[PDB]
Amino acid sequence: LSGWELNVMTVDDLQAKHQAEAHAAIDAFTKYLDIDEDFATVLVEEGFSTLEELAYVPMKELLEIEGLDEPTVEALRERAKNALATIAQAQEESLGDNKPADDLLNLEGVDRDLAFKLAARGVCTLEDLAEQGIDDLADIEGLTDEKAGALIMAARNICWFGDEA
Amino acid sequence: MHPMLNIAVRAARKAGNLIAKNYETPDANDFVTNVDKAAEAVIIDTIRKSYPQHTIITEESGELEGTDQDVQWVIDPLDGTTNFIKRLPHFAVSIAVRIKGRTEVAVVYDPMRNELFTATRGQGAQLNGYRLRGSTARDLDGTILATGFPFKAKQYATTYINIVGKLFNECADFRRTGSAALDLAYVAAGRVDGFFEIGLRPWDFAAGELLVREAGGIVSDFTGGHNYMLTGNIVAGNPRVVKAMLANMRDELSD
Amino acid sequence: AMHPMLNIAVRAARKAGNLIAKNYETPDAVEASQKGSNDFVTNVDKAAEAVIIDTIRKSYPQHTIITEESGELEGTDQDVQWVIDPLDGTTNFIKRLPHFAVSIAVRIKGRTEVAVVYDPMRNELFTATRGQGAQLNGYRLRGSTARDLDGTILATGFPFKAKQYATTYINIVGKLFNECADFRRTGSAALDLAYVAAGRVDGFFEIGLRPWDFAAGELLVREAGGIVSDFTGGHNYMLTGNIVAGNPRVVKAMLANMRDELSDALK
Amino acid sequence: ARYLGPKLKLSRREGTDLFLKSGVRAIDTKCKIEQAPGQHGARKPRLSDYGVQLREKQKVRRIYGVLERQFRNYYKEAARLKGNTGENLLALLEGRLDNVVYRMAFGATRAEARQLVSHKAIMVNGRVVNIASYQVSPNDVVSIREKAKKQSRVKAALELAEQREKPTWLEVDAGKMEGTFKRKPERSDLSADINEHLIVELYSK
Numbered sequence A: 001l002s003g004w005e006l007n008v009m010t011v012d013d014l015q016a017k018h019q020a021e022a023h024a025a026i027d028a029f030t031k032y033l034d035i036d037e038d039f040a041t042v043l044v045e046e047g048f049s050t051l052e053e054l055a056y057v058p059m060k061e062l063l064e065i066e067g068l069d070e071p072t073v074e075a076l077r078e079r080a081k082n083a084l085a086t087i088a089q090a091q092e093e094s095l096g097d098n099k100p101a102d103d104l105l106n107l108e109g110v111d112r113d114l115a116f117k118l119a120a121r122g123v124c125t126l127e128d129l130a131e132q133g134i135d136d137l138a139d140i141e142g143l144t145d146e147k148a149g150a151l152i153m154a155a156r157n158i159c160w161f162g163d164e165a
Numbered sequence B: 001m002h003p004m005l006n007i008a009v010r011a012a013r014k015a016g017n018l019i020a021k022n023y024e025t026p027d028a029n030d031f032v033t034n035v036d037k038a039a040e041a042v043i044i045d046t047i048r049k050s051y052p053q054h055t056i057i058t059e060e061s062g063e064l065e066g067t068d069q070d071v072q073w074v075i076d077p078l079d080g081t082t083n084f085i086k087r088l089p090h091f092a093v094s095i096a097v098r099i100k101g102r103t104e105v106a107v108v109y110d111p112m113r114n115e116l117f118t119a120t121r122g123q124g125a126q127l128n129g130y131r132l133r134g135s136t137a138r139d140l141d142g143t144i145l146a147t148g149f150p151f152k153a154k155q156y157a158t159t160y161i162n163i164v165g166k167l168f169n170e171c172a173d174f175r176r177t178g179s180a181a182l183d184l185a186y187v188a189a190g191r192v193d194g195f196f197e198i199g200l201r202p203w204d205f206a207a208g209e210l211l212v213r214e215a216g217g218i219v220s221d222f223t224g225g226h227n228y229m230l231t232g233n234i235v236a237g238n239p240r241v242v243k244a245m246l247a248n249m250r251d252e253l254s255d
Numbered sequence C: 001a002m003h004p005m006l007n008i009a010v011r012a013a014r015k016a017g018n019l020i021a022k023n024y025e026t027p028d029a030v031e032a033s034q035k036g037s038n039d040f041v042t043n044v045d046k047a048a049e050a051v052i053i054d055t056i057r058k059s060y061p062q063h064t065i066i067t068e069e070s071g072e073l074e075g076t077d078q079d080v081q082w083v084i085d086p087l088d089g090t091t092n093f094i095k096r097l098p099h100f101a102v103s104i105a106v107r108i109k110g111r112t113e114v115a116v117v118y119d120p121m122r123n124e125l126f127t128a129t130r131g132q133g134a135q136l137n138g139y140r141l142r143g144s145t146a147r148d149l150d151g152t153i154l155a156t157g158f159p160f161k162a163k164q165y166a167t168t169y170i171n172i173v174g175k176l177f178n179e180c181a182d183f184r185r186t187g188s189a190a191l192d193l194a195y196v197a198a199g200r201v202d203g204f205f206e207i208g209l210r211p212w213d214f215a216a217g218e219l220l221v222r223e224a225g226g227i228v229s230d231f232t233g234g235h236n237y238m239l240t241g242n243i244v245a246g247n248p249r250v251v252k253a254m255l256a257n258m259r260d261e262l263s264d265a266l267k
Numbered sequence D: 001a002r003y004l005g006p007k008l009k010l011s012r013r014e015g016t017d018l019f020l021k022s023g024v025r026a027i028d029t030k031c032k033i034e035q036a037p038g039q040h041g042a043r044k045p046r047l048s049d050y051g052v053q054l055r056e057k058q059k060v061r062r063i064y065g066v067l068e069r070q071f072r073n074y075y076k077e078a079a080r081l082k083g084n085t086g087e088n089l090l091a092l093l094e095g096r097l098d099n100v101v102y103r104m105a106f107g108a109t110r111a112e113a114r115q116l117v118s119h120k121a122i123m124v125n126g127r128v129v130n131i132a133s134y135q136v137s138p139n140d141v142v143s144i145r146e147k148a149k150k151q152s153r154v155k156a157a158l159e160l161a162e163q164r165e166k167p168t169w170l171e172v173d174a175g176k177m178e179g180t181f182k183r184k185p186e187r188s189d190l191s192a193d194i195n196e197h198l199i200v201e202l203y204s205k
Ligand SMILES: [Mg+2]
Pocket: B059, B076, B077, B078, B079, B080
């Protein structure tokens, strides 16, 4: 009708991400603001998203704006140590859903790297392995048709041939 | 992956037009072989317009080989010929685009009801603009099973009968249409939950297995392996009904 | 010309089929409402039934009507009965499988007089009136030309509501599969009968059918050159829900084949 | 995973102004990023759409169905023509036979055009000159041979041309199964999502 192409993603969530994305990270800004609500907001005129380099600017930036006191900048640098450690820890956590279990590790032809490969397609349980054929479990980096075949067979023994769990 | 399916659906539409336009003439197996050959002819000649080098596998003359052996094209311009013989309006053209031994594209097209199910890895299985889902069942209560009888291999029938018997004591009802490809297409759109057949042949169900798989389902041979590609003792559906059916049908194995 | 009651019935069937087809494209509105052992009765069945009854009442406020849902609505002139199935094969509709039909038959003095079945999906209209024959959108219907059991296609329904006879039925099934060519199982006795009238199946049989389902097909196959009977050649079928029908020779062969396997419960 | 670290490295390995930070002060002045103001200044020879230019070259080549060697030959032949080169390219590439074939539907594809010109199915000036590399002068009549106008191929392709956009600059005779050309189409009657001045500056820099 409108002729204008349309896009439908969200209206409350995930929509500021298009334009209000550099001001919507509620964690750090408000975790610093809860004691700043008496003092002030934060200084938006610099991005400081990439806080590392732009924090190594002289008194000019610290003189121009108030609220980011010298002990404030130093305590917040310790908290930014906490923040870079938080980024590293989030990196660590983002690599946790692979699900190597005994029901998924000791099976024939399954090393821990076979676990990492099968979940590298998105298999976070054993039943999922029994929910694909050789054609669909393909494209794995180092998984032929007969190996995956016997693996599907093992999954369907532990699941569907003995009809158990 | 677009242009392969493009040629596929082009040949499918032309073949269906031919089949229907012919079906509008009266009669009371000469004619069906005539129209089968004519449809295959139009299909292949429209194919050679693009990639006249892929190896075509029909259901009649074995494997019409080609100079570019990277892609096989499984063809059946008519399945369940019995239908078109006896005027029953239920039959579809089945085209399958397979590569390296496995299949990538599939198109089944019913001319009469003008249904057209496409399917391809990742991009899913569509019915003229529908992200198909398969059925929603998780059990064998209030469910439908698209069955199939060995109208050429009646020896299994007895144990087959047993299966039916036990199946009837478990499931809710049965269906039977004769077009195995259409059974597959129906389990793809969840029109019927589970499908099974004794001793089919790849030229027919090649596209249908790709359909049911792409629609979130899975296939199997009677003994859970994958020799179906050579044995055609198919059992297909969403994993729920496949377990709920295999658990009760494997104990009567004869193939 | 045309038979009057037939005409009003086909108008009713057209309206009902259009309603069913219009609702067929919104499966989020029609729910599964079960009545007995896997005999769903969705609200769409109720709506189609009401539409048919309304359309009839315009032209016969006095004719007693029969319906699986509303039982038997009496009329001031109960010599003529209107048997209806607004939907046949409710299961095929709930699974959104596009193979079903509405069936309207009119009996006079007990003997069935006119019948129509309508499939909206394929848009096929099997009409039949005694003393004039059966038509499929304008073509006469002389059933299958089969005269044996070889090469014959047998449509059937399974007793999936009277499963006690399952074995028995299955028993005979096996016997049949030793002589026939192939089976058909569609899920709507009305449409199966219709196909018998069109020769698209060389015969048909079923156990456990309600009296308000074959009433629209038995006349169809009768004026289609075919015949019906119970599992023994009698006529108690109207009470046993056990039907076997087809062109005469095939019916004879089927009866002679089935009489032995038959469990004496149905006899 | 929150980007709270190296910005020089981030916006240099990305090399573009994705607008992560607002960037209130001039970015190039804060540090030595690869991007300098006054775009035409620091890299004085610079052609806009610097990476897609060759992709659009392959596009015009796929619609022409031609190769690079004859493309550069046409280029050197057109550089000798007095006038605007940005239009003379398309002019000399329009004065050929296979293009007007794709138009008048001998072959519905310019590749099928080259096939039919190489298939001895194109009589030009009433003479069999099947080499596709001629410049058939405008105001000329071309058709298919007189013994092949009942074919499935010819009838199909001519009906196809009839079903495509009918050129006002090429009198297509679907009954006479031919084409009569008068003059190459000017700026008005060509595609409006194409680049030639950029191609001219790339071939003339
Ligand atoms: Mg076939």
